[PDB]
């Protein structure tokens, strides 16, 4: 319960607010008088058991708000947020397993640029996100996505740069990804992905890739066809053999290989001048190539390998890595 002069000063100075609570009344009223607010986060169940949103209506006067967070298990998206989202940018919505109905309400939001439906259990693409024409970063994490063909609709969008599928149950990756061109930082790890088609690789603007924690068996040579990759991760995958053609791709700042299968690192690692960090754990390896020392930005701590494999290296190379 702030006093009036402090309330005015806060109205003129505060930028970010993070409200967490248990009971609905716990939320202060005076926070809605704030006028220079841009970052608002709500934690604690907003459900007023029908006839809800009477508290939330204060967001009508929070016209300066830019980013909003709803970790409150909403069965339905509020009308207040759709009204205020004309100027809004980010809906970080977390339902903790609560099924959220989109009800085409995101269509109102046009200036929106980042959307994250986390643990909202969509089970399918909302099909309303495609209406937005300024979205750039989309995140669907832990929502039980089985078949995701609707991602073809993303070719309509043009500001998109990052597609996030951190956790789901996707089995087969749609070939229609080939139409997508402008995406860069796909993170579709932790999924029931058996294999990767070349259709993902028809894209050329891919900066970050996260084909990890899946059921991948082999890597097509077309990874080397990509010429804009920086960070790659195939951790916890049944990768029997690493194709040398992947090593054609340059500018690989990092390269994660964890919990893999018996392999043999090609000497073509010498063409990894941009490598700075790399892991070689959880995979049956016995002879790390000397060309590892060829890497100019590789540190002893940077290369995460078991100690014995670290020992198999030539002693001078071991010294070179240590001094790094």
């Amino acid at each position: 319960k702030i006093e009036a002069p402090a309330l005015a000063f806060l109205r003129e100075n505060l930028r970010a607010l993070h409200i967490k609570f248990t009971d609905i009344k716990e939320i202060p009223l005076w926070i809605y008088s704030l006028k220079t607010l841009e970052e608002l986060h709500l934690t604690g169940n907003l459900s007023a058991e029908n006839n809800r949103y009477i508290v939330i209506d204060g967001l009508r006067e929070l016209k300066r708000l830019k980013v909003l967070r709803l970790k409150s298990n909403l069965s339905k998206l509020p009308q207040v947020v759709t009204d205020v989202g004309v100027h809004l940018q980010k809906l970080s919505i977390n339902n903790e397993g609560t099924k959220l109905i989109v009800l085409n309400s995101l269509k109102k939001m046009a200036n929106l640029t980042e959307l994250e439906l986390i643990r909202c259990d969509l089970e399918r693409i909302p099909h309303s996100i495609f209406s937005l024409h300024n979205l750039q970063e989309i995140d669907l994490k832990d929502n039980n996505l089985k078949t995701i063909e609707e991602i073809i609709s993303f070719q309509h969008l043009h500001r998109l740069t990052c597609l996030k599928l951190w956790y789901n149950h996707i089995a087969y990756i749609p070939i229609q990804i080939g139409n997508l061109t402008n995406l860069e930082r796909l993170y579709l790890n932790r999924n029931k992905i058996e294999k990767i088609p070349t259709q993902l690789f028809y894209c050329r603007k891919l900066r970050y890739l996260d084909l990890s924690h899946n059921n991948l068996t082999f890597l097509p040579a077309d990874i080397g066809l990509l010429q804009n990759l920086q960070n790659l991760a195939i951790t916890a995958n049944r990768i029997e053999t690493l194709p040398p053609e992947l090593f054609q791709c340059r500018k690989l700042r990092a390269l994660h290989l964890g919990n893999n299968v018996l392999q043999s690192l090609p000497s073509r690692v010498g063409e990894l001048t941009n490598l700075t960090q790399i892991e070689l754990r959880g995979n049956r390896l016995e002879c790390l190539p000397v060309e590892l020392g060829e890497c100019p930005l590789l540190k002893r701590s940077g290369l995460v390998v078991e100690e014995d494999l670290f020992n198999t290296l030539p002693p001078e190379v071991k010294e070179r890595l240590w001094r790094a």
Partner: protein
């Protein structure tokens, strides 16, 4: 705009549609059997709101190929269901498990608010697919050209009532939950997708079998059966009228006419469940007058007309949409003519649409009715009052030019030709030409081409018993000087009528040339022959001075039909700007109205004379024109008296209201004193008269009243509870004249914003109260432009407001001033109307400079 690739043509639909109330959601199956004529791997489904869950296409008998395509062109409302394998050619079935929702924008399959007798403010699921809305409810081929049969089946709570296009054929239980049941209807015949309709709510059953046998039924909520009984009789009389008319059976074994609480669209033609607005359809016997019954009969028959023209033979594309309504409209009037002969409806029909047809073509933005359409979004702005009124006028023109029986044969042949098949306007013209032989299309092609109606400089040549003359076809202009760069002449089939028989045209020519000759046998040396007949020809006949003088005795008495008299009256007022003499002749025709008893004649005469009075502001001398109005109204006010008179109908009640109001506008001393008497009697409560007289009494008393009467009026508005009574009180109290009073009533119009969105009508009344006070109110609303725009955000209400406010201006300088004001204040929705009004004002100015000064001289002859 792109239409559809149309690689697959639908054949049959199976829609196990499930509305979910209390969640406002929607599920369904969408099992459509279709034919893949084009060997393509991609399927185009226009639909916007639906979120497809799963899709699977099984061609013929083999297994389906599931789905690997979901391209959501949301802005185009399109979806692409591509498949891994080719679909070649053959008959297949596409099953699309999907999800949708009851929108709150009153579109597609929305939810409407309704109140039970106890209350509960519950919701109901209702449909309307005007244009590009069926696809929003559930994915199909949303194209009028596309035609297929549908089998609508609903998953509805058993307590709730559900109606659809066809009759119910099954009421099976729903296995998943027993609180709701599956209602399966019969298979619809071949029909368009936008014509599909099914509603779910809480209503009561009121049936009435017809002579043919079809049970015309209405489902008013709260079982207000009585409210919906007159319309039942009207439908049960007019449907067999159609059946014997064109000898074609009704398509649907069941016909329903349900009303919906705040339909927000007025009405919508549908296959056998035509929905209505509650206020439009139901009629309380004690809360209605005969005119409201006439209106409800008109509207109920309009959609029944749409059942034939429309449903049976849908328009090929929205370009022909103008016909599907327009023609039907005229048909409906004919129907009522055969249903309530005591209700002489053509008389008000001429005043109902034909008047704005005439006045709107005179101005700019008079685009031809038939405008090419590629995108259904263009329908909104290609649509206007002209699209209805001029279409009805020209189709009635065609009926007269063809003859009743020949038009009957043509319509029957056209219906039997392309039943359940899309047809174009040219096809209708071809069928009509086949029936008759004379070229209809040779006139219809020009009617689509150009824009407007012609004029004729008639002549006088009475060679013994041959009244020959020279009709001269030329384009019409509001000012009078038509642009005429192109060929202004037309081929209107002006059907002359012999005036010896008021209803029968002994002499009638299907003239369609810029110049021609006459062939007739005259009966009387002064036959006052009536060009046109009841203004059946949408047209503005300009009679010569000799013609006017010859017909003057015909209009002095009641020998001429009242429709002819009112048409001539309207023509002369419009032709004051273009035709010469004007006021001088105007006065002579005024003399005829010394004996006119017809109400509609008085209504449009009062409109015209009020236009003159407001228009004559700048040159003043209102006392002279008001004195002339008193001279005109002396016999009428005497015959009607002042108090209610025995034998007075509701039309006579409108007569007394108009005569009292306009007599007070004139400012008769005795009339004003008596009006003040009854004002005192009502405010004291010693004698309170009918509201119908009361509101014009308010107008008259405030026409020469002080501020105390104004405060009393505000008070009476406060205790008054009836909404339209208060609206009438406000609009008549806008008619004060004292400058301090007009400023005060402007500020009180700021106070009278209590009426929900009726503030526009209140402020229109205050603007129309005075003439120079109208300019003061225009300055006032200049000072309150933002308030008006924040009360109405680009609606038809604000366009009506501005049109009312600026209609009385006749000065070019402040015309340009208000033009610049509107330029600095863009209102795109009203934008067209804006410049319309502007040009009108200019014309007004010109008309003033044409004759206003000489009007003084005419008055010098009047009193002499």
């Amino acid at each position: 705009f792109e239409r559809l690739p149309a690689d697959v043509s639908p054949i049959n639909y199976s829609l196990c549609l499930k509305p979910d109330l209390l969640d406002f959601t929607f599920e369904g199956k969408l099992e459509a059997a279709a034919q893949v004529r084009q060997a393509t791997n991609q399927i185009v489904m226009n639909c916007a709101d639906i979120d497809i869950i799963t899709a699977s296409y099984a061609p013929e008998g083999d297994e389906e190929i599931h789905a690997t395509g979901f391209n959501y062109q949301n802005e185009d409302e399109k979806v692409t269901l591509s498949f891994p394998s080719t679909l070649q050619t053959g008959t297949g079935t596409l099953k699309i498990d999907f999800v949708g929702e009851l929108n709150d924008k009153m579109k597609g399959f929305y939810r409407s608010k309704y109140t039970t007798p106890s209350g509960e403010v519950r919701y109901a699921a209702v449909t309307q697919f005007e244009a590009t809305d069926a696809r929003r409810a559930f994915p199909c081929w949303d194209e009028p050209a596309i035609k297929a049969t549908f089998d609508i089946s609903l998953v509805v709570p058993k307590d709730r009532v559900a109606l659809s296009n066809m009759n119910v054929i099954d009421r099976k239980p729903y296995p998943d939950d027993e609180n709701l049941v599956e209602v399966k209807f019969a298979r619809t015949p071949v029909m368009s997708t936008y014509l599909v309709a099914f509603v779910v709510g809480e209503y009561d059953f009121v049936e009435t079998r017809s002579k043919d046998g079809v049970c015309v039924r209405v489902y008013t909520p709260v079982g207000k059966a009585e409210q919906g009984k007159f319309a039942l009789e009207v439908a049960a009389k007019t449907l067999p009228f159609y059946k014997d008319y064109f000898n074609v059976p009704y398509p649907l074994p069941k016909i329903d006419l349900i009303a919906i609480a705040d339909f927000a669209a007025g009405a919508m033609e549908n296959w056998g469940l035509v929905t209505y607005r509650e206020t439009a359809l139901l009629i309380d016997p004690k809360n209605s007058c005969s005119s409201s019954r006439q209106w409800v009969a008109l509207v109920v028959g309009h959609e029944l007309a749409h059942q034939w023209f429309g449903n049976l033979v849908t328009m090929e594309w929205w370009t022909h949409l103008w016909l599907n309504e327009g023609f039907a409209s005229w048909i409906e009037y004919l129907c009522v003519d055969h249903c309530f002969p005591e209700y002489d409806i053509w008389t008000q029909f001429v005043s109902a649409d034909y008047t704005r047809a005439q006045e709107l073509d005179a101005l700019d933005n008079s685009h031809p009715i038939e405008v090419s359409v590629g995108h259904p979004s263009e329908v909104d702005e290609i649509f206007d009052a002209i699209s209805y009124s001029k279409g009805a006028s020209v189709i009635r023109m065609l009926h007269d030019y063809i003859g009743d029986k020949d038009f009957k044969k043509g319509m029957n042949m056209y219906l039997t030709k392309f039943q359940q098949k899309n047809a174009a306007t040219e096809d209708l013209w071809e069928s009509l030409e086949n029936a008759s032989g004379k070229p209809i299309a040779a006139v219809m092609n020009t009617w689509t081409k150009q824009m407007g109606f012609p004029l004729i400089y008639v002549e006088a040549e009475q060679v013994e018993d041959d009244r020959l003359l020279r009709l001269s076809q030329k384009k019409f202009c509001a000012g009078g000087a038509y642009v005429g760069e192109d060929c202004p002449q037309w081929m209107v089939p002006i059907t002359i009528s012999t005036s010896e028989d008021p209803n029968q045209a002994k002499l009638k020519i299907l003239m369609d040339k810029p110049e021609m000759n006459v062939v007739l046998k005259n009966v009387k040396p002064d036959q006052w022959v009536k060009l046109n007949l009841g203004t059946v020809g949408f047209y503005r006949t300009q009679y010569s001075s000799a013609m006017l003088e010859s017909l003057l005795p015909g209009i002095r008495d009641l020998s001429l039909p009242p429709v002819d008299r009112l048409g001539l009256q309207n023509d002369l007022f419009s032709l004051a700007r273009a035709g010469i003499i004007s006021t001088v002749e105007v006065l002579k025709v005024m003399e005829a109205f010394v004996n006119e008893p017809n109400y509609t004649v008085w209504s449009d005469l009062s409109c015209n004379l009020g236009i003159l009075s407001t228009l004559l502001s700048h040159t003043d001398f209102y006392e002279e024109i008001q004195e002339f109005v008193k001279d005109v109204f002396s016999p009428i006010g005497e015959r009607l008296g002042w108090d209610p008179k025995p034998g007075e109908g509701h039309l006579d009640a409108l007569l007394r209201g108009l005569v009292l109001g306009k007599l007070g506008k004139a400012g008769h001393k005795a009339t004003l004193e008596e009006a003040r008497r009854r004002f005192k009697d009502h405010v004291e409560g010693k004698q309170i008269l009918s509201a119908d007289l009361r509101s014009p009494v308010y107008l008259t008393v405030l026409k020469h009243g002080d501020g105390t009467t104004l405060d009393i009026m505000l008070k009476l508005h406060k205790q008054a509870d009836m909404q339209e009574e208060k609206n009438r009180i406000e609009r008549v109290l806008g008619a004060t004249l004292l400058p301090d009073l007009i400023q005060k009533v402007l500020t009180f119009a700021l106070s009278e914003e209590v009426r929900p969105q009726d503030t526009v009508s209140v402020i229109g009344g205050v603007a129309g109260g005075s003439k120079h006070g109208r300019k003061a109110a225009w300055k006032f609303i200049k000072d309150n432009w933002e308030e008006l725009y924040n009360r109405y955000q680009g609606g038809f209400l604000i366009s009506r407001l501005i049109k009312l406010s600026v209609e009385g201006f006749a000065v070019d300088k402040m015309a340009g001033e208000v033009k610049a004001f509107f330029e600095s204040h863009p209102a795109p929705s009203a934008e067209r109307t804006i410049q319309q009004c502007c040009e009108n004002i200019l014309l007004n100015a010109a008309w003033l400079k044409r004759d206003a000064e000489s009007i003084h001289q005419y008055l010098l002859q009047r009193k002499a």
